[model samples]
Target: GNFLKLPDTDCRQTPPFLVLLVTSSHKQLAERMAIRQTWGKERMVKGKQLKTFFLLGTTSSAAETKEVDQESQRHGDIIQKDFLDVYYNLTLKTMMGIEWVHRFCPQAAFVMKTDSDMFINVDYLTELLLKKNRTTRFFTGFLKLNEFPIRQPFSKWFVSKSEYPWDRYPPFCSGTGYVFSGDVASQVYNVSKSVPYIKLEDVFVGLCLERLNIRLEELHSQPTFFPGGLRFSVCLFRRIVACHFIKPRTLLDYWQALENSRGEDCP
Candidate 1:
């Protein structure tokens, strides 16, 4: 109903094995562009088709809308809804991406939902994670377990008692990055029809998985998805699946460094 710029035929034209659904804001064009040129640039990995799409919500200015339209026209990778774009509505943005996958690309083998600011080692993710283990019912990222909700009224992540009424949250992957099987898209979207929307998008997805009797698997490795920024290094970047809180320029720099360091040994 709120489709502004929908890539309805992207998957139908050339179905992808893996689709990257990047949650972006209307103003983060630079971040999206850097991502396009870097880790998100790869359209195919090891002969397995891959695709990326940026999810956004409505903006306030007509100029901003025109700019987003031009970006969509040039790239054909932007997905926008009518919901007001804001920090608190991130859940809607994420859900919009899931809905798109559920409707347009249900055949995709896997989907990775991440933010625009994240630095994802897409190759490592596909080669190391997706290929090594193509298990069904898969859902994982940086796991957060039994975490207590912030109740402070002034806190940015405050959760009212009426909203959750619980002390500890169910196991959830961090919003910085998470991957799930394609089937999970339909499951989550169908289940979401009944589950109340929470501002915490990752936690909400975890709740959906929990309700569906799907267990969150912990990727067996030393922290790959960093919840915070890490000191950039080719060696370090090579080992990680995703890193959070990266700048646009620094993302490109890291990509370039990693490119140049190809075939070199990392101590």
Candidate 2:
């Protein structure tokens, strides 16, 4: 069967939107599948077209680490080996996925880049993007900033002086739950090709956005690490778009909560 085919009535008349699910090789595969399934089910109910891509990072192997180290040295002036390998894998996944989307789904209006552990309220996200004025360039997420340091290992996102001697990074949104216009997605991908890859994928993506002069805004919502429960009390499923970094033990509970609230009238 032709997998891409959708019925005329079901097809999105306008360009479809995409949500890229970036997962690491370190995480449990079953849990990742569950997240994708939940997102698929919700999007189906909403009649929205979405795509999921799983990004597997470095496999558990000593040989792979050696090869990564060799590659890092070859590049000279590259990010440190420990963080560099993860960054390389993530950047590869992000760039390749975006490129695939651009080539195959030219009409897609927006792209939502997020992690596998997160839960995205697709209906709310769609409504927000659709309601926003089209003239506005779209880039929304939780933003972060830190003063660049001179020594390595001083910060969790440490970099050697020889690698990146910068004092600070230009303001950019956290990569956890970000939305970008389709055009901006292409732009970010294009810019990344030439830029040196940074250790932190989120920060590196932010740097790319800055170089391209893409305007970004911080979206306040309860992400994965936040204290709130899965379902909002007042709006239920109407306001929140994504919850990031959820713990595995609570996955079933959250899933049931989301399902229980389904078909309820939105206030």
Candidate 3:
């Protein structure tokens, strides 16, 4: 169920040093609203500048447009394309973000593609970026290396020999959360037109990286992203970058708890 219910995110403003191009859906209106009222609304994180935008596509229900209309008018942070949203079509959404950033906010220092429901530590991430103090033709986050395509008949990720004959996917960062220097968006987008399209966006990016002969740089301290299987807590999850498959209520609660635990003890 490639489900999403969210608000509109306008992208007219100047891009900041860090830009979060979140992939959302027209159905996640309430979730999007919750995010704005919380972390996503921030224009600054720890005194450093920041900009955020959400990408969206039409819902098959056709019931999603009215809310989208209202949200677009309200917060002005959504960028909706005409494409229909589904699990396999995620590649289109990802490409849209890359092209949009390169075309509209080319000056941005870094760009992160994240999901609407994930919890992202923007401040920590910025500090991590600044600590590195430089950029390369790069991409990193939840890396999935040399994964063979799933060919199960009923599997959601099935990739037949016809769709992809290769035994292993070119190493790729999971789309759940991955960041790259802003400079490479155009390069990726331009080269993507020539590369055969794949339903898998992250894998496609890996292909682009392979074509460009570049690779992902791991995050310091915590090299990979945490998943639902991992435990979470304040002070417990040190310098963790993201939380995935998060619900709206849980998102707000965890965010508040994390903020509250900054200097306070929670054992």
Candidate 4:
């Protein structure tokens, strides 16, 4: 409810094509810091500008809270909403991030919601995905099409039939890495308020976009987006936008490996 009413937040600079929001749990301090030092390190890329912001909810642990506060103080990139930082509340975390963009950086060109355990090649996204063509109302990711929610009661993503009786989810992007044009951020958030809240963050956003006729697109350059973690490959890494399931210690290592491969011949 407070998403719209939430006060404006601050960003380092006005974004031109990308505003990456890394959704993190409070305890993942190592992951967050590692990100800041690696992929999140830059304030600009190529000739375009982008910003990296952390989205989180309050932590129960005072010690962890102190760390988040200190990090925010030092980098000024964290945005926290009032809620428990748990898997179920992830939808809220996502919404709040969108809220921040709508209120604080609405004019920015694009917005991406990713996780701390992921790496994004912003230059690839801006050049290949966004500006490859000039169309408004765009959204794309590792898209999942014609999928149904798990009905089993024991599964982590289990959904009751009453909650979702549909046989398949509207085509939706993998939440691990998705990017949308800036104009659609506020549109999705506003649509969410009028609809029934769904626990699945990505699908909920999909529902909003679906209603708005903003279809989910499949990135033909799927090599750049890793829906699930895989063993690192410098050659493989050279071809994509982002990878998922990275650990804190490995985040820096992966970046170094990707960076180090710049001049080496692969063929």
lDDT of 4 at 94: 91
Give the worst 10-residue stretch by lDDT in candidate 4: 3-12
Among all candidates shown, the one with the greatest lDDT: 1
Better of 1 and 3 by TM-score: 1
- The sequence of per-residue lDDT tens digits that candidate 1 reaches over residues 1-267 is 457788646666677887898988888899999999998885778888878889989889998889998998999888888999999999999899999888878888889999888899887778766544755688989999888989998998999999888888888999999998898999999999787667999989988998999898866557778887788888888888899989899889888888888999988
* Model 2 TM-score, all chains together: 0.70
Task: Evaluate all candidate structures by whole-model CA lDDT and list the values in order.
Answer: 0.86, 0.57, 0.75, 0.79
The residue-by-residue lDDT of candidate 2 on 1-267, one tens digit each, is: 111211122213545665554544433555555664566442442576765554433445777656544533442211121222254466565665465445545466777667656667776777666666552356776656564543657665667766666778767665666777777766776787677677666666777888887766644434322223354452544577777666544555676776787777666
Best model per TM-score = 1
Per-prediction CA RMSD (Å)? 1.6, 9.0, 3.9, 2.7
Task: Tell how far residue 48 is off in model 3, in angstroms.
Answer: 2.0
Off by over 4 Å in 3: 1-15, 265-267
TM-scores for all candidates?
A: 0.95, 0.70, 0.89, 0.91
Which residue pairs overlap in candidate 2's backbone?
A: 223-244, 224-244
Model 1 local distance difference test score? 0.86
Reference-based lDDT, residue 144, model 2: 61
Order the candidate numbers by TM-score, best to worst.
1, 4, 3, 2
Residue range 27-122, candidate 4, lDDT tens digits: 887888898888887566776777778887887889988877777777777778779889999999999888787767877777889988887777
